[PDB]
Amino acid sequence: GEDSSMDDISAYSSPGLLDDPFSIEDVDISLDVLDNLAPQ
Amino acid sequence: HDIEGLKQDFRLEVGDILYRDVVTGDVAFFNRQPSLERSSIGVHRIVVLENPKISTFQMNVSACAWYNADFDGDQMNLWVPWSVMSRVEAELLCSVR
Amino acid sequence: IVESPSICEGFVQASSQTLVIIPDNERITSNVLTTFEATRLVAVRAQQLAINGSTMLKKKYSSPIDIAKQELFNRKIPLLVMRCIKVTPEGQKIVEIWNPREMGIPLLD
Amino acid sequence: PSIMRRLPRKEGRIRKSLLGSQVWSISRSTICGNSDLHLDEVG
Ligand SMILES: [Mg+2]
């Protein structure tokens, strides 16, 4: 009960945590010309 | 054949294909992304800017309504048709008129 | 009993078809070229002129596109428009043959 | 890496290589205003 060699690696981080509404996934626009989407 | 490594011919042979520079009056497809309407790709008559310090695609402000474009930093594609078949159809079908 | 596959079934090559041309008086399609058909005619003629260059146009132009346009406008273009109406299961391919020398050209010049 | 992973997403085979295309003989630049050009003309 005093051992740390085999502790869970993912448990050292903060414990705990279908379409993304803000992701342009079905919009076919080049990533280098994204300024056309600026609100202006 | 290159043009710099070939300078011994007085003229050209019939049937050859010449890849010439783009001149004023040529038609070109002119596009802005995203292409939502079918007027987002239109055919414009090219006016070649002889000033070597100009690097932008200049167009009339009244033509922005086709592409939903403005001059806050937008970038637009442009490809000049070279095939005869595609050059005919640009003038007759895809013209911005 | 539905038995093992035979050679009668399993053919990949589709059977050949017979071109059934609708008679002129029984045609239903319009007597006016669409912009798509006129553009295709002009493009095909321009490319063929770029290949061959043999034309009967009396005037002289320095571009295949202009020569093709004037040939279409002067009704001297050696092409026909075949409008595929229906492909029948028995094998027939009913089409419509239209002459662009006697149809209205929608283009402008 | 798998054969079927190449298909699905936006960067997949269908949406990037078939429905879309990388082409030659094309140019891109910032657009600009020019009141001396016709509406059917581009500088
Ligand atoms: Mg903008």
From TrEMBL, chain A:
Superkingdom of this protein's organism: Viruses
Protein name: M1249L
Species per Swiss-Prot/TrEMBL record: African swine fever virus
UniProt lineage: Viruses, Varidnaviria, Bamfordvirae, Nucleocytoviricota, Pokkesviricetes
Gene from which the chain derives: M1249L CDS
UniProtKB/TrEMBL annotation, chain B:
Family affiliation: Belongs to the RNA polymerase beta' chain family.
Subunit annotation: Part of the viral DNA-directed RNA polymerase that consists of 8 polII-like subunits (RPB1, RPB2, RPB3, RPB5, RPB6, RPB7, RPB9, RPB10), a capping enzyme and a termination factor.
Function: Catalytic component of the DNA-directed RNA polymerase (RNAP) that catalyzes the transcription in the cytoplasm of viral DNA into RNA using the four ribonucleoside triphosphates as substrates. Forms the polymerase active center together with RPB2. Part of the core element with the central large cleft, the clamp element that moves to open and close the cleft and the jaws that are thought to grab the incoming DNA template.
Protein name: DNA-directed RNA polymerase subunit
Organism from which the protein derives: African swine fever virus
Taxonomic lineage from the root: Viruses, Varidnaviria, Bamfordvirae, Nucleocytoviricota, Pokkesviricetes
Gene (UniProt): NP1450L
Automatic annotation (TrEMBL), chain C:
Subunit structure, interactors included: Part of the viral DNA-directed RNA polymerase that consists of 8 polII-like subunits (RPB1, RPB2, RPB3, RPB5, RPB6, RPB7, RPB9, RPB10), a capping enzyme and a termination factor.
Keywords, in A-Z order: DNA-directed RNA polymerase, Transcription
Residues of the full protein shown: 39 to 147 of 147
Domain of life per record: Viruses
Spans through the membrane: none
A GO-annotated cellular component: DNA-directed RNA polymerase complex
Keyword Disulfide bond: no
Described purpose of this protein according to its UniProt entry: Component of the DNA-directed RNA polymerase (RNAP) that catalyzes the transcription in the cytoplasm of viral DNA into RNA using the four ribonucleoside triphosphates as substrates.
Family of this protein: Belongs to the archaeal RpoK/eukaryotic RPB6 RNA polymerase subunit family.
GO molecular function, a single term: DNA binding
Presence of keyword Transcription: yes
Name the UniProt record assigns to this protein: C147L
Gene Ontology annotations of biological process type: transcription by RNA polymerase I; transcription by RNA polymerase II; tRNA transcription by RNA polymerase III
